Symmetry: C5
Subunit: 307 residues, 5 copies
């Protein structure tokens, strides 16, 4: 097996999509191995640019094809370069721009903490014919940066592992184990936009819904709380588009459901207060003194749900 020494340089991470859980990584990859010595013009290394690499692979040069496993589509490989040294070592440099995909988990949605993963692996040569020695990831252009809404926290974690493939067990009997490099970058979402845009107005609307009890009539109370029903209908539209159709519920939609429950509870309470008249004349003050009980109960429900 030949020892290849990868050195990825993340130039930028952008386009971080949460609907499809993809992101775009732009950067450089530098693989380096050693082979039989050769004679170059002079004793200085020879730089062979893009589309001149095919004039050398045709003549018998060995350049492996390192692919990215977790990519969506194919990478947009721009320039590429091959440095040939007289002492016998080859360096393959390339520029990649990929739409990578990782399994994201938005259980906590506004205060979410995710990681971006690049997986690199030879396409043809297993670990008996090509092994990765080491990786250095030079993530210095995004070291502590706000990319669009993510803080990139700390360094990048690098790992080299062996993967078993079973569809190649019928064509390669005992050597189908492929070397693989995994690079993980930890990112933390910036919750400020959702705090001042999706949580403060929901707080104001729910507080206004609490204040419907201070009217001294009935039909005016019903009409006002139905208007607030319509208003909290609007926020389902306003928050639908930012996230995927997840089977679980996040914090933002837990407040939406709590707002629906509060509106419906207030309407049902004033309806039952209208029907509490056993003789048609009895006034209700114990159930209408929920002006201190309903906000405290909502705070307790919100606290037990958030805890």
């Amino acid at each position: 097996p030949v020892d290849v020494s990868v050195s990825i340089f993340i130039n930028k991470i952008y386009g971080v999509n949460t609907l499809e859980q993809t992101y775009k990584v732009d950067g450089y990859i530098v693989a380096q191995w050693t082979g039989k010595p050769r004679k170059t013009p002079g004793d200085k290394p020879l730089i062979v640019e893009n589309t001149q690499i095919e004039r050398w692979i045709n003549n018998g040069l060995w350049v492996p094809a390192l692919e990215f496993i977790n990519v969506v589509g194919s990478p947009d490989t721009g320039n590429k370069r091959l440095m040939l040294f007289p002492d016998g070592r080859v360096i393959y440099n390339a520029r990649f721009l990929g739409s990578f995909s990782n399994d994201m988990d938005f259980r906590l949605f506004p205060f979410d903490r995710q990681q971006f993963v690049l997986e690199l692996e030879p396409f043809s040569y297993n670990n008996q014919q090509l092994r990765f020695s080491d990786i250095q990831v030079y993530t210095e252009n995004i070291d502590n940066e706000e990319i669009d809404e993510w803080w990139i926290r700390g360094k990048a974690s690098t790992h080299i592992s062996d993967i078993r493939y079973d569809h190649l067990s019928s064509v390669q009997p005992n050597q189908n184990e492929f070397s693989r490099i995994t690079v993980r970058i930890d990112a933390v979402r910036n919750p400020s936009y959702y705090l001042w845009s999706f949580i403060l107005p929901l707080g104001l609307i729910i507080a206004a819904s609490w204040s419907v009890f201070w009217l001294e009539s009935f039909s005016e109370r019903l009409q006002t709380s139905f208007t607030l029903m319509l208003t909290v209908v609007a926020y389902a539209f306003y928050t639908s588009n930012i996230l995927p159709r997840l089977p679980y519920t996040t914090y933002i939609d837990q407040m939406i459901i709590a707002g629906y429950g509060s509106i419906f509870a207030a309407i049902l309470l004033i309806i039952f207060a209208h029907h509490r008249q056993a003789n048609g004349v009895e006034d209700d003050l114990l159930i209408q003194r929920c002006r201190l009980a309903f906000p405290l109960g909502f705070l307790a429900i919100g606290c037990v749900l958030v805890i």
Copy 2:
């Protein structure tokens, strides 16, 4: 006829679109056949990478073109590889990423059960010149997984069949029958998101519409039920985008139509109660005691429609 032994490895299924009934399958295809023996360097097999396969097909190697029938666009074939063995057998490995399309049926929409189909077929050689022996589908990366909102249920069903083509009956008189491989993966939708997002608030709004009868006036009742008309207008917008313009109706839109019918029935009932005054003085209590009759009738209508 030469016997080709396909072995598809589904790496992932994603991007499952219901508006256009397409999905994206990313994976590997491994075809294997046998030919005349040859001399390789040594006695070890020879790996010929991408764009070096054309230097061999030009010299006279026989590599068939296996296409995907149900694809939208063309597959984004990334790397490809050709293993040539000294004993005479050839193995063609390729990586495919396709936007496939199948005929989906959303009669039941939130509890829907669908299947994803890959169809593979030679482009040029009929079953007198190329036959498929067997297929093993290695769907172990999506075996029991929630891809975005689908459970993948169990194994993958594989089939090999013969297809008649009639536009080639004028150019190939008696041999136009093409071998074909069909792979079906059964997926079950996850109804949780529609349960807590599109059914619970419609239930609350329809219950609030039931509670309009407990007012003791007339014009307040009319204004309140028209506000609820507007609110259920909003949910047509809110549910329009998730599905294709189907000629039939699903469960979600059956509840939308039931909500429209309930609002209009309540408005028409209170209008007829206002016009039931034969002398201008007669009060109505039998038709205004539908506070127990309207929810039970709605439950019976919903139950007979759902059954």
Copy 3:
């Protein structure tokens, strides 16, 4: 002139767009002509796959370039194939996927009947050098099918004609007449979705607008009819996106305009009833008995407009 015998096989029609009046046709094209005899390996026909056709056109083979006239962009030609027979005849098979465009007419919008047109024509050789003998269109995969919302009615109509081109009259003096094949498939829209989604709720809202006269006040009538003004404002949004900005009006927007006219007529009528008080005391009953006159007048207006 050489006689080419085209045989198109429509595999599917999908993506039928009405905003841009394009559609996507996926299928196969099989052209067949005869030339000088040749020696193949044995006496069996020779199949030359994709990218091996260029090794034959370089050596002097004659393969014409048949283009599609009404295409948007360029076709996504996938595989292609060339069958060379020892008796001297050549067969060029190709797989095409095109975004074609035809002049659609949505005068009647929900009950619309359109046709999908494929036009095929040589790029370089006029009818003195290349003539089309016949076409057989094998539309058996979409024969009577609901593609997304269109019934495909019956067979496909095929035509072969000659087209004059006048920009080539300065470079080809008397022979600029190009052969052309036109294929027309008749499709009929499925009006069910618009019936139960865009016409039933507009009917309910217009009926509720008719029922505003049964109030016995004035300001309540004005506020209610302005709420219904807002509701029919919403349907302009709800129906804007499904169709192109046409200079004429369809059935759906004729109902939108009729709803606007009904709301404004009711508001103007109750305003004039408020101002009919010549002494400030005279009550109006003849103009307020339009509870039977307004729905009948709306039905007559709708019937004369639809007829």
Copy 4:
């Protein structure tokens, strides 16, 4: 300098975008020049198709690269063709599909009159080495047609000019003047859709806003005019998407601003009528008789603004 005689054939103009001020032109280009004589097979002209032109440019044929200046992206050149005549003249035919861009001016928006411009120019050879003799534009397929919403008015205006380039003044000292062809097609927008969709309902809503004065109360007037405030808020959404963020204002948004001013003027007038009570008892009839003054004043303001 060699004399090239271009002959553009506009096949269709479509996709006319106003947000980005681009449009798509599909058609053919035919350039023709004369060179040294040559021997062809026989004495008939030789047709060299796509990808066979490179076998001739490698051997020393001179084919200039005519580019389009005002294009967005690169043209999607489909087929191309080269006719070589024994008398010594060459004809280069190509099919182009370009997203062209022109500086549009929507000062008058619904009754707008624009022109579509194609600019063609050699890439390498200045007018000392390549001159354009003439252009004939064969715009007969779009001569008087409604493309999507534009009438194409009359013929196409053709011009041949010389352009100075100053970045090539440091590499070409005295000859950097490039020949150029400009083709202008005049199109007139079809205002019918905006008349019956964006102007008639704004007229109805503004008329209903005029009719708020005929109420005989105060708070009902305030609530009604605030509902109409909300309704004219909706039309900002409804008209935002059809046009670019222009620094000036068009006719449609001038009516939106006039509607906002009318609603606010009516609200401020009834507020000042409520506060005109110097003793708390004085009734106002001169300022409340604006039921004839407000519509006439709005008509005068609209007329002076439109004139």
Copy 5:
């Protein structure tokens, strides 16, 4: 090191996206260096077009690959050209169309001032093997122009610097310093559209919210201010799409938050005025005379926030 003399000609800047902070630059690049002399046909310079450059790089010509660092995707290089002079100097001209990306800062959003940056750099040769002598940027086509909504202010600032790369420090020990050219163009946003579209109606709605105190009731005040709550909910939708989810807040959203605070303050004030009745009979005039205090306080809050 060889001295390359770049000369960029910005043809246009368009497509300026603020959601993703990218923009599209279309133009020409002209690099020029000197080498060993050569014999051309005659003594006139030799123009080698696109795809004929590969016939010269194969024979041993030295053409460096200048890449753009801050690009998204890869540039859409259209035509390219190579001028070879007998005195020994080479000129490489190319046409580029790139989606470039720069770090934008929308702290002030409507009156924003940004700059568009092009960064150009050799891919393979460091500054010991390739140095940039100078750059002239010919930005005369966008000199003082309104591109879509940006004024381009003045000339373009050009800079040539040296960049250290550390992933190449393991393969190039002491010479990994790459020459680089940065071009900055200063653009100023045109605030007119946001002034007459997003600030004038928010001013009108906030003024109408100030005018809720002039009612002489309580429940009518509450219902009116809740309607204005709904109206300012709509503008969060109306302004969400124009900008990225920034952690800070701009001017437009500061007015949105001020409108929410004003509505909630008015509602809470009238609620506390209803509960100021210590005996159930005491009328409030000092707290209800905020008709002059609330607008002045809002003006002071807006002024201290804007300053």
